[PDB]
Structure formats: C-alpha cells, structure tokens
C-alpha cells in the first residue's frame, strides 16, 4: 500500500508507508471520522508478541537485526516473561523506547527535537520521598537556568496494577485554582479539582492567583503524599509588553518549564504509569490557551479595556487584536529573561521540515492536524496547508484515568 | 451505535444518532484518520430514489401514505422505463436545502432552510444558462442585502450531455503569470484565466479583473459571457484607522457563489448547480488576501504599519493579519453589503448544532473546515468536538470540466 499526502501551499506530495505498521485503532470507522474527539494488567500471552516487535524494532534500529545479541535477547525476554510474567528492559532499550514514544506522538509539533532527550532511569525508586528527590533533579536539570533541556523521568513499570507509581499532578509545575463561594474562580480554573484534593490532603494554600501547587506523589500503589517543590527551582517569568508599559501592571506571569506528568508510557508491552516529561513552551500555549481560553485565566476583556478597543461589537475584532499583543508579550518576556521558548511560526516551520525528513527516512510521520495547527493565526503557519495522516505507533504516551478516580485508599 | 460529543468550554454533551444513517465512506479506517485530506444504473438508482422519497415523506408527515407509495411506484416505473426520473418541484426544493443542511464543512448552515431555489431544468443552451445565472446573481446580490440562492440546471443523463459552469465561482478575479515569473491577479485562477484567453476573452491584465462566465450546456462546448458589471457588487477595502490602507488598492466582490460542485438528490446528479450566500470575513481577509499562494499581501501591509519584520517572534504577520481583517469587515459594513465575522458565524453554528442535535439527533461537522483560519481557540467551535460523516442529498466535488471534456 501507499498513501499520498499533499501540501496545498507548495504542491509537495509525500508517500506514506509507515502507516502499514500501525496496529492500534484510531476511533474512526469507515462510516465516521472522530478526528476532533479529545479522548477516543496485561497477561503473559498478550505480552511476549508486544515485547518481540519492540525488540525487533530496537535491534533493527541499531543495525543488528537477526544477530546473536538479538536472538538471545528474545530468548532471554521470553523466558523471563514465562517465569516472572513481566520483564525488565535494558537501559539502552528504555532510552530507545522513550525517544520513540515522543517520536510517535502525533499531537506533538516539537518532534524535530525527539532524539535530543535526556532520560532519567528512576526504576529503582521505591517511595514517594524517593519520587520527590527524582523530580527535583529533573526540574533542576531540565530548567538549566532558563536554557531548557528536554527530559523524562521513568519510575517503575506497572506490575499487577495494584502497586502503581503515579504523579497525581497533571504537570509538575502548575498554578492552583480555587472556587469561591460567590461562584468566581481565583487562580487557574483548570486545576480547581486537583487543588481541592491537595487541600483535603493537608496542603495549606496561599490562596493567591499564581500559587505553584505541591506535588502529590504515589509510590508502589500506596496513598499519595505531599511535597513542596523548592521555590528556587521553579523558574518563572513575569509578563510585560515591549510597548505597553501597563501590561506589567496586569500582574501576569507563568512558569518556564512545561512538564507533563499524568500520561502513561508504553514500551514493548510494559506500562510506565509515572513518566513525567518536559520540553519547552511554544508561545501560544500560554498566550492563547492558558491566558485567553474563557475557562482559563480569561484576560481578553481586561487586556482589551486597557488597550481601549471598541468592544461594542465583535466585528471590530477586539478579541483578535488583544490576543496578538498578549502573545507578543509572552514571547518578549521569555526572550528577555533568557528562558527558552519558541513561537508558532518557527515551531510549525521546523515541524514541516521534520515531517518531510521523517517521510524520507521512515516512510511517514503520524500527525494530528487538529492538535498540530496553532490556536491562532492558523492559516498563516505552514502546517495548516499540510495534509496529515494520523495513526498509532508504539512505543507511545497515552492518557490514563485520573488517579483519584481509581485509587484504592489504605 | 450511540456516540456522544462534548464541548470542552461549556462541558455540554450531545448524543449523536444521525450518523447511523451514513451511506458513503469517509476515507478513514480504524487504522488511519484521513481527517485533514482535502478530498479522499436502474439497480443503483431506484434504491437511492426510495431512500430519498422516504425521507421526504417522513419530513412532510406522510410516511407510508398512498401518496408516498404511489410516488414510489411512479418513480420505480419511470426508472424502469426512462432509466431515470424527474423530481417534483417540492422534492427539488427539499433536496437542495438538505444538501446544504448536510454540508459538514459549511459553518453557516444555521441558514439552511432559508434558501431560494431556481428551477433551471428547462434550460437547453448556454445563452439560457447565462440568463438564469444573471438573474441569480441579481436576486442574491439584492443591492448588498444578500440572499442565499441556488440555480439548478438539467440533471445528468448519459454523461456526455452534462451541463457545466467551468468557473469555480460565478465571480472571481483573473490570474496572469508575468514576464518576471511572478503572478498578477489571483494565482488560484491562473489556469482558468488562461482557458478564457485561449478561448477569446480579452484579458485587461489587471490585478482584479472579473473573469467571464464559461458556460457549457448539454455536453456542448463552453461559451464566454460577461456578467453585466452593474450586476457585480464590489467593495473597495479601506481601514477604520489607517487612511493609508486605501493605497493598498484592494477590493473584493460581495457575492460568493460556488459553481463547480455537483448536487445529488435521490440518486440524480445535477452537475451544474451554482449556489451562493454571503461571506464570512476571514475567507477574504485571511485566505484570499494573506494565503501565501493567493494575493499574499502580508509583506506590504506589515511594512506600511512600520513594524519589525526582522524576527518572526514579533508576530508581525499576526499583527498585520488582524488589521487586514478589520478592514475587510469595515469596508463591507460601510457599503452595507452583507458579511459576517468569524466570532458571530461560529457562535451561530454552535446554536445551530444544538438545534440539529435535538431535532435531527445530530449534525455532521468537519472540524478542520469549521474552525476559522485565524483566532481558532477564541471561537466556540474550537472547543466543540464534532462527528463527521456523509449524508445525501449532498454537494460533492467533481473533476474540472476541462480535464475531462471532449471538444
Ligand atoms: C522541545 C519542546 C517541545 C515543544 C515546543 C512541544 C510542543 C508541544 C505542543 C504545543 C503540544 C500541544 C500541547 C497542548 O495543546 O496542550 C504538544 C503535544 C505533545 N507533546 Fe510536545 N513539545 C515539546 C517536547 C515534548 C517532549 C520532550 C515530549 C515527550 C518526551 C513531548 C510529547 C508530547 C505529547 C505526548 C503531546 C501530545 C499529548 C496528548 O496527546 O495529549 N513533547 N507538544
Ligand atoms: C449564508 C451564509 C453562508 C456562510 C457565511 C457560509 C460560510 C461558509 C464557509 C466559511 C465555508 C468555507 C469556505 C472555504 O474555506 O472555501 C463554507 C463551506 C461550504 N458551504 Fe457555506 N456558507 C453560507 C452559505 C452557503 C450556501 C447557501 C450553501 C449551499 C446552498 C453552502 C454550501 C457550502 C459547502 C458545500 C461548503 C463546503 C464545500 C466543500 O466541501 O468543499 N454555504 N461555507
Ligand atoms: C474539541 C477539540 O478536539 C479540542 O478543542 C482540541 C482542538 N485542538 C487542540 N490542539 C492543541 N494543541 N491542544 C488542545 O487542547 C486542542 N483542543
Ligand atoms: C490540508 C488541509 O486540509 C487544508 O489546508 C484545509 C484545512 N481547513 C480548511 N478550512 C476551510 N474552511 N477551508 C479550506 O480551504 C481549508 N483547507
Ligand atoms: C512536555 C512539555 S512540551 C510543551 N510545549 N507543552 C505541552 C503541554 C501540554 C501537553 C499535554 F500532554 F497535556 F497535552 C503536552 C506538551
Ligand atoms: C456558497 C457561498 S458561501 C461562502 N461564504 N463562501 C464559500 C466559498 C468557497 C466554497 C467552496 F465550495 F469553494 F469550498 C464554499 C463557500
Ligand atoms: Zn478520521
């Protein structure tokens, strides 16, 4: 088979063959497309085949397929699975797996950096305090004083599903959200529920607008525990505008390190329920979504008012106008504090190059157009005019139920 | 089965059942999503006809009635004899309105039922087509107070007597390649603009030259016609705060009228069915004006705004784009020509979606196309999950007439 993909701005056409290897489902039938849908204990028998194909890829990637080292590793793994039911990955395999989970993330526009990933092996970790230490070292290393470095910390793989390691926070660093009895929300609305669990667990909220939440860490299936990330480790950027000297008075700021912590990493059948990973922000994530979504900080009106814009009628495009300035401010601020960050133009342009490269070296690049195209100025970024094929490849990062909706408390 | 759709901004969940009536395939499988790909007989005809009539009568609360049954046999017998059939007026009107209603890429379907239908089925020549088209352009333009409409020429028979409108839209600017190697006018129509020259049209070689209509009737060869200039309402683009804007020398037409698609009703194929409504701002401001492959004007507009175009991180492109779309909307409103902005259009569509879900049990929607090409996440449709599937009657793409015609 062969599937063609065309870019309507360059007339460039690409041939995808990589999709042939996709085994997982898409949520789409032949009679329906669910492309815009947000979220559409393995047994030993189910496990070996998964390990095999994975190990086949690995060895193939190091140009040693069929070798003796390859066969013996298969024999070694098969045996281990039969006797122990599970199986431990080699350090080289773990690093290969993680980079590929990233490499296969169809919703990630920053994959051009996929091979530059620092992997921290936290498989010997046994307690929550242990997880805390590991996370602090990840935050410090990745931040690097503003010169951000991609990194991922991998805790023990799931066993019987009763001794899972979970990082309850959705991101290592995030601002608390509090619901007021008057119905309004102070802080970040998106984190209200998690904030409550933290308070309910003993956290003492400063009840402010940008309070870095504490970590809630679950080790070996035990009840989660609270820890406060060392402030001197949480790099933040106050947001000011290059021309609007009143912007700083808006009292805005954001953290510099985006580190996802609620996803599950799958490598050769194994499941790593705790695998926080971080990179660096694309401006629009903060400028458009975090600040302007109606269900987030929702700063449009206040930014507009101060800009003195005709807010009487939408057709004046006051919302659009204010959005640009706000995103202007985010990029400017980060660049001024020498904290890594990329704008949607550069990010989407690099992604197009990475995508083409991937087609010519792997035979494809699974991509989710709904997620790749930026939440602003969509059509003036190259990805918009790019047809994409979305399919599933492992290793991979997946979502998992929120830990508070499944955890069996002790 | 029973699929649900959630809006992540309001948490509202709607259940979709309408998809269970999907006929055609989407191009997507369980192994791959083709969502962003722009385009993935007596025995055949009667079932389709029955499906349609069934829906029609169901809508008029006469499902099963003798009328329903009689009509069914009548068509059945007609197909057995004439190897095809004709729609009664009522069924044509319904068919066309419903083709619009099922257009998963149209953001303005909230207007679906308010569609004027012009039966051009008695047309036999190109001059006739021209007459029908002119009256359509005039009725729909209504001096700026646009009214949606569609004109339906004779349905296909043997495929060699197909009626076709070679233009992609009734009104579009010509595209000429210059000595340089660049392009004057609209790069999107360069080829058609060539087929018009290669046909006789005397191209004035201007930036915004309204192309001539190239009509084809009963499989014959296309003929050129110049739409009465008095019938082509145009808006000169000026800015509400940049009096230098007028100097960009930009203008666009007020009437968007798609004419290269094919209308299918009850198995029947109407290869010539121009339809029009009114512009959503972004269409011109973002796509026609700023698309790199189109008029690509961001370069200059930025200059004139005196902004740092040194680093992409200054978002000068974004900055310009906004002002430009301010101007388009501003101009149209000032000349009282109908136009809608992306904020209002999308808000309207969300409401339409909510009505369609409780009245029809669903609303086919293509997210990739529904979300405006600018300020995506600040419009409601961005946070709205959508289910895409095909339903007939429908509007479909069809091969360019020049790439398939036997002169
Ligand atoms: C180097 C900086 C990086 C940039 C600029 C980048 C940018 C992005 C952006 C803009 C999104 C969408 C986020 C949202 O809308 O919530 C995304 C999604 C994603 N990225 Fe990256 N990324 C980078 C690094 C990484 C790293 C290091 C990994 C993994 C090791 C990764 C894995 C993912 C995944 C799994 C998704 C999709 C998640 C989902 O399906 O919900 N990214 N990335
Ligand atoms: C009255 C106001 C209308 C508005 C504001 C509206 C707006 C839109 C917009 C923004 C698009 C995208 C255009 C593009 O990107 O090329 C679109 C697509 C579409 N609209 Fe509407 N529309 C309206 C009327 C109509 C009418 C009267 C019909 C049919 C009778 C219709 C049929 C379609 C079709 C079929 C498409 C998608 C075509 C395809 O699949 O490529 N629209 N519309
Ligand atoms: C409903 C729709 O799927 C949803 O709003 C998606 C659209 N595209 C997105 N794209 C990115 N990068 N991030 C998101 O959260 C979303 N949300
Ligand atoms: C490649 C991608 O499908 C293509 O650029 C689509 C995206 N969304 C669109 N949406 C609308 N309304 N109109 C278009 O022409 C497109 N082009
Ligand atoms: C890993 C830091 S890379 C980055 N730029 N940000 C995000 C933010 C959210 C997600 C998601 F997983 F929540 F979608 C993914 C990447
Ligand atoms: C019918 C006028 S309704 C409108 N706003 N414009 C368009 C423009 C192009 C198309 C398309 F068919 F080319 F995609 C559809 C609608
Ligand atoms: Zn799909």
Short mmCIF file of N, CA, C and O in Angstrom, two decimals, chain B residues 176 196-197 199-205 209 212 224 226:
data_model
loop_
_atom_site.label_atom_id
_atom_site.label_comp_id
_atom_site.label_asym_id
_atom_site.label_seq_id
_atom_site.Cartn_x
_atom_site.Cartn_y
_atom_site.Cartn_z
N UNK B 176 -2.93 36.06 -14.01
CA UNK B 176 -1.96 36.08 -15.09
C UNK B 176 -0.53 35.95 -14.57
O UNK B 176 -0.17 36.56 -13.57
N UNK B 196 -9.66 31.06 -20.72
CA UNK B 196 -10.55 32.12 -21.18
C UNK B 196 -9.87 32.91 -22.29
O UNK B 196 -10.51 33.37 -23.24
N UNK B 197 -8.56 33.08 -22.15
CA UNK B 197 -7.77 33.79 -23.15
C UNK B 197 -7.69 32.86 -24.36
O UNK B 197 -7.91 33.28 -25.49
N UNK B 199 -9.64 31.06 -25.29
CA UNK B 199 -10.98 30.92 -25.84
C UNK B 199 -11.47 32.19 -26.50
O UNK B 199 -12.46 32.16 -27.23
N UNK B 200 -10.79 33.30 -26.25
CA UNK B 200 -11.19 34.54 -26.87
C UNK B 200 -11.25 35.75 -25.95
O UNK B 200 -10.99 36.87 -26.38
N UNK B 201 -11.59 35.52 -24.69
CA UNK B 201 -11.69 36.62 -23.75
C UNK B 201 -10.47 37.54 -23.85
O UNK B 201 -9.33 37.08 -23.92
N UNK B 202 -10.72 38.84 -23.86
CA UNK B 202 -9.63 39.81 -23.95
C UNK B 202 -9.24 40.28 -22.56
O UNK B 202 -9.77 41.26 -22.04
N UNK B 203 -8.30 39.57 -21.95
CA UNK B 203 -7.84 39.89 -20.61
C UNK B 203 -7.22 41.29 -20.50
O UNK B 203 -6.25 41.60 -21.18
N UNK B 204 -7.79 42.14 -19.63
CA UNK B 204 -7.27 43.50 -19.45
C UNK B 204 -5.98 43.55 -18.61
O UNK B 204 -5.46 44.63 -18.31
N UNK B 205 -5.49 42.37 -18.22
CA UNK B 205 -4.26 42.24 -17.44
C UNK B 205 -4.21 43.08 -16.16
O UNK B 205 -3.17 43.62 -15.82
N UNK B 209 -9.41 41.60 -12.17
CA UNK B 209 -10.29 41.54 -13.33
C UNK B 209 -11.35 40.47 -13.15
O UNK B 209 -11.02 39.29 -13.02
N UNK B 212 -14.83 36.10 -17.01
CA UNK B 212 -16.06 35.91 -17.78
C UNK B 212 -16.61 34.52 -17.47
O UNK B 212 -15.86 33.64 -17.07
N UNK B 224 -18.24 31.94 -23.72
CA UNK B 224 -17.95 33.03 -22.79
C UNK B 224 -19.06 34.08 -22.74
O UNK B 224 -19.78 34.28 -23.71
N UNK B 226 -19.95 38.01 -20.46
CA UNK B 226 -19.50 38.97 -19.46
C UNK B 226 -20.68 39.35 -18.55
O UNK B 226 -21.68 39.91 -19.00
#
